[PDB]
Design a protein around this nucleic acid. Structure first.
Ligand SMILES: [Mg+2]
Length: 945
RNA sequence: AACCCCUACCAACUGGUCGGGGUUUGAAACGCCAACGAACAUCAUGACAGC
């Protein structure tokens, strides 16, 4: 539920000294000051008003009103007064002053609530970076080999140049002449060579291979070492409490040698130069057809089409073109684009791109014309553009059934001026595509930036993207862009409201947060372009024919794989005789989801996962239960393509048939039909059936693995947070011990913030006595404190007074807490009781396994032992608890041993055990509850609960 | 919905009704950008060839 104040235009309410400054939305992420509050007086800075604000009753808030967007039910909207309670409000954990000191020196004084917000944005950036670097490192370690951990702590520490790493004897001054450390470097170089001739290194085609002609060539050893060292340096920086500190990422021009800068520049220039040098020959058809449709010379919009297609400037625009396009497609005049499959399944994307460009050009041209006209009129009477009016209406939409009506109405409004253009676009056919490629697109000056201009941080993010997949890249880069935009907006706002805080030198990198956002937008556009597989070798063929299912030994598999690209004599097959090789390459090896599965698992075990029936039915039912195209349509589409044409079957029967197809899967059904497969034609239905079956099978396994990886990422974030907060509380001046944080079950922070210590069998004599004496004082001093409650306390019965004395001790114990979360007596009586019954060695196991991603490596081992698969949260914690039981079951004692027995009996997870394992998160109640209760875990699954 | 704050009525006040607020709570401020989410909507018609 969006708050009504944001719809009415109120964006922020800041405190500086004894004054309150309110701020409204201006453009994109920018902010404009609106009101200044002094005591009981409210002044408006600007001539116009984005919102009217007046003082409310008891000076407890400001009533907000807008002429256009009023509250639907007529209730009053009040924004809170930060000075009503007292001084500036504090952080929930009470770490405001420490963080402000760390990030701003003595230039911050504490009479404001603006610096803490940029600090929290930086903290969010670090959070998501720590989430994704772990997955990248695990992928690289998985691909490298077995027991060959090449990336982590203590390896490739980005301090040593490649020359010092290959011949340490000739460069022993850089190692401080230490024989033990020198012998460690040589052993690392041996692992480097063995990793560099791995046949399966080609899965990272972008990172290590470059395309020269029609075939890929491995980069020089310098570049590969530099990339690996950069990734290991990121891994070191994540766990920084050495030469890699917390400030390593923000000072990269003084910590990195010229080699690393050269490698990053090489990669960036490589991606930019191909896009620049291939635009004219690749954008000819679309540009020529659009020119014919509109009726203008291509030179009049070539650059604008460049910015639309390659740089993707239609996304930083204030709204979504795609929704308008879909509303346009919903009409009866243009419905055949969806119904007529046989004519449009090969030109759908071209038509969509053309329509989007037409809409975007319409808006851009209208805005430019209005802006040009608004140059001779007086600075008072000026008209807005259609972009501005649409964004103004969108911002004040209190819900979603109002936002969609706006899209519907404006699509219908702007359809009247583009009917002919769309009707001409709909008349496009693939056959006449080579006709529009005869004349090439106009040449352009360089628009994309070079490697030198971009910062090292952005280039390092682009390098990191080469170890991930599309969804993760999108999430990471979008979050980073949002956080940097917030930081830059706050930094521009701060001068106006009288705050003269400046970043300390080590964190001066954030003084230029606006350029980083633009660079990251370009990188988000770039990261999804390029071939990710390099070449195809025999190892990839074996992996492909091992995920479908075989019961063959290794030598037989090698012979079968050699059959792909060799004859019965020993020479290579002639051109055009590769028909089974191309099928496998195009249908398995070249699938993005297969790349995901290889990057996060073992091919032979994913087949074991796929032989299960319950998980397959669960995934297919999840597909079938998608509302708003529909999930029921997709189930029918699979059945019609994979099984055939039939009528009278319900959803359950189709799901059962598809499950039977998926569960029984083997490579022999293709080796026997090899003759049919090598018959390439348009009437070979069996070939298409095979393709559809393979695609669906891969999709199912991909979903199953992806959800597990996401949940593990959540728990990694949680433990990163507990480590960071332990460091901060130590720096504040408390009595935490960081060296013993691991032998204790990561629960020292929870003990520290709970308050008084009673678990000690030495001082229970005083704590129980001290609480008793302060409890008795509060009862006597009640009429003075709370007279209204005292008038009812006397009327209590004698027995009821006794209960209130027991509760008063819990209240007194809660007054000694060190958080704002744990000062509530409700949560303190809960967290304390959990502290007594934990097992320290079990909690350390949960933390270690989550970081290493060992849940994803043992799904197949315990998938057949589960009783039911109702959700991924329920499946995740069965595998996690079965792993812990393997190592610690004989030595377990207490309630944990009782809990372990329950898992073996009922064959599901234990709710009570999860709460004990989540005790490290107890000092932060929202994270403690979200990570321990299924109902609050997933935001998208809330209708079910 | 969970966590925190506030006006008015009642309440051991470790709790509730009518409603508002929170970028300084939790993967989580607004418009975007994205995700759950499925043949999937591209720098390049499709199929074939090329590894
Ligand atoms: Mg936040």
């Amino acid at each position: 539920k969006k708050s009504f104040a944001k719809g009415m235009g109120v964006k922020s309410t800041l405190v500086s000294g004894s004054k309150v400054y309110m701020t409204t939305f201006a453009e994109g992420s920018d902010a404009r000051l609106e009101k200044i509050v002094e005591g009981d007086s409210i002044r408006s800075v600007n001539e116009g008003e984005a919102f009217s604000a007046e003082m409310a009753d008891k000076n407890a808030g400001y009533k907000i009103g807008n002429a256009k967007f009023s509250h639907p039910k007529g209730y009053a909207v009040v924004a809170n007064n930060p000075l009503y309670t007292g001084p500036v409000q504090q952080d929930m954990l009470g770490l405001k002053e420490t963080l402000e000191k760390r990030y701003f020196g003595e230039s911050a004084d504490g009479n404001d609530n603006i610096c803490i917000q940029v600090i929290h944005n930086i903290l969010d950036i670090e959070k998501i970076l720590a989430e994704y670097i772990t997955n990248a490192a695990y992928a690289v370690n998985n691909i490298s080999g077995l027991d060959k951990d090449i990336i982590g702590f203590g390896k490739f520490s980005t301090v040593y140049t490649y020359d010092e790493f290959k011949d340490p004897e000739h460069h022993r001054a850089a190692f401080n002449n230490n024989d033990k450390l020198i012998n460690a470097i040589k052993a690392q170089y041996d692992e480097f060579d063995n990793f560099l001739d791995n046949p399966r290194l080609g899965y990272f085609g972008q990172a290590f291979f470059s395309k020269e002609g029609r075939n890929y060539i491995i980069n020089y050893g310098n570049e590969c070492y530099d990339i690996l060292a950069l990734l290991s340096g990121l891994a070191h920086w994540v766990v920084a409490n050495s030469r890699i500190s917390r400030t390593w990422l923000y000072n990269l021009d003084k910590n990195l040698d010229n080699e690393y800068i050269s490698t990053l520049n090489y990669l960036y220039d490589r991606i930019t130069n191909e896009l620049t040098n291939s635009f004219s020959k690749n954008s000819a058809a679309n540009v020529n057809y659009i020119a014919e449709t509109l009726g203008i010379n291509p030179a009049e919009f070539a650059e604008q089409y460049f910015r639309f297609s390659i740089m993707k400037e239609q996304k930083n625009l204030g709204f979504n073109i795609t929704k308008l396009r879909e509303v346009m497609l919903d009409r009866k005049d243009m419905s055949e684009i969806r119904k007529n499959h046989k004519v449009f399944d090969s030109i759908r994307t071209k038509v969509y791109t053309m329509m989007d460009f037409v809409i975007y050009r319409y808006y851009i041209e209208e805005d430019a014309k209005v802006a040009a006209a608004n140059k001779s009129l007086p600075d008072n009477e000026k008209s807005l553009s259609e972009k501005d009016i649409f964004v103004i209406n969108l911002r004040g939409s209190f819900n979603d059934d109002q936002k969609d009506a706006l899209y519907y109405d404006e699509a219908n409004r702007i359809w009247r001026k583009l009917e002919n253009i769309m009707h001409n676009i709909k008349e496009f056919r693939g056959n006449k595509t080579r006709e529009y490629k005869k004349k090439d697109a106009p040449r352009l000056p360089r628009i994309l930036p070079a490697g030198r201009d971009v910062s090292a941080f952005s280039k390092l993010m682009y390098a990191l993207t080469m170890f991930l997949d599309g969804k993760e890249i999108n999430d990471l880069l979008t979050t980073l862009i949002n956080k940097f935009d917030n930081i830059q907006s706050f930094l521009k706002v701060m001068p106006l409201i009288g705050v003269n805080a400046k970043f300390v030198e080590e964190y001066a990198f954030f003084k230029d947060s606006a350029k980083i956002a633009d660079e990251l937008r370009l990188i988000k556009s770039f990261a999804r372009m390029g071939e990710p597989i390099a070449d195809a070798r025999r190892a990839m063929y074996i992996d492909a024919i091992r995920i479908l299912g075989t019961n063959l030994s290794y030598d037989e598999l090698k012979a079968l794989a050699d059959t792909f690209s060799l004859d019965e004599n020993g020479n290579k097959l002639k051109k055009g005789k590769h028909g089974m090789r191309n099928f496998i390459i195009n249908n398995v090896i070249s699938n993005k989801r297969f790349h995901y599965l290889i990057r996060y698992g073992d091919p032979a075990h994913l087949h074991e996962i796929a032989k299960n029936e319950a998980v397959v039915k669960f995934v297919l039912g999840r597909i079938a239960d998608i509302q708003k195209q529909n999930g029921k349509n997709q189930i029918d589409r699979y059945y019609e393509t994979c099984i055939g044409k039939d009528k009278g079957k319900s959803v359950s029967e189709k799901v059962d048939a598809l499950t039977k197809i998926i569960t029984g899967m083997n490579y022999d059904q293709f080796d026997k039909k090899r003759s049919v497969i090598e018959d390439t034609g348009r009437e070979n239905a069996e070939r298409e059936k095979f393709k559809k079956i393979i695609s669906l099978y891969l999709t199912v396994i991909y979903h199953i693995l992806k959800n597990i990886v996401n949940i593990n990422a959540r728990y990694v974030i949680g433990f990163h947070c507990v480590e960071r907060d332990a460091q901060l509380y130590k720096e504040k001046g408390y009595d935490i011990n960081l060296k013993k944080l691991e032998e204790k079950g990561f629960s020292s922070v929870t003990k520290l913030c709970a308050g008084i210590d009673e678990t000690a069998p030495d001082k229970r004599k005083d704590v129980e006595k001290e609480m008793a004496e302060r409890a008795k004082e509060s009862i006597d001093s009640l009429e003075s404190a709370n007279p209204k409650l005292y008038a009812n306390y006397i009327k209590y019965s004698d027995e009821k007074k006794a209960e209130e004395f027991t509760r008063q001790i819990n209240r007194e114990k809660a007054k000694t807490a060190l958080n704002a979360y744990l000062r509530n007596t409700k949560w303190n009586v809960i967290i304390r009781e959990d502290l007594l019954r934990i097992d320290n060695k079990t909690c350390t196991l949960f933390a270690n396994k989550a970081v290493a991603l060992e849940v994803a490596r043992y799904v197949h081992a315990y998938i057949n032992d589960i009783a039911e698969v109702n959700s991924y949260f329920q499946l995740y914690h069965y595998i996690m608890q079965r792993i812990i039981m393997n190592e610690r079951y004989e030595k377990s004692s207490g309630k944990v041993s009782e809990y372990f027995d329950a898992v073996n009996d009922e064959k599901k997870y234990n709710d009570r055990l999860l709460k004990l394992l989540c005790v490290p998160f107890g000092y932060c109640i929202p994270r403690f509850k979200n990570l321990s209760i299924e109902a609050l875990f997933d935001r998208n699954e809330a209708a079910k609960f």
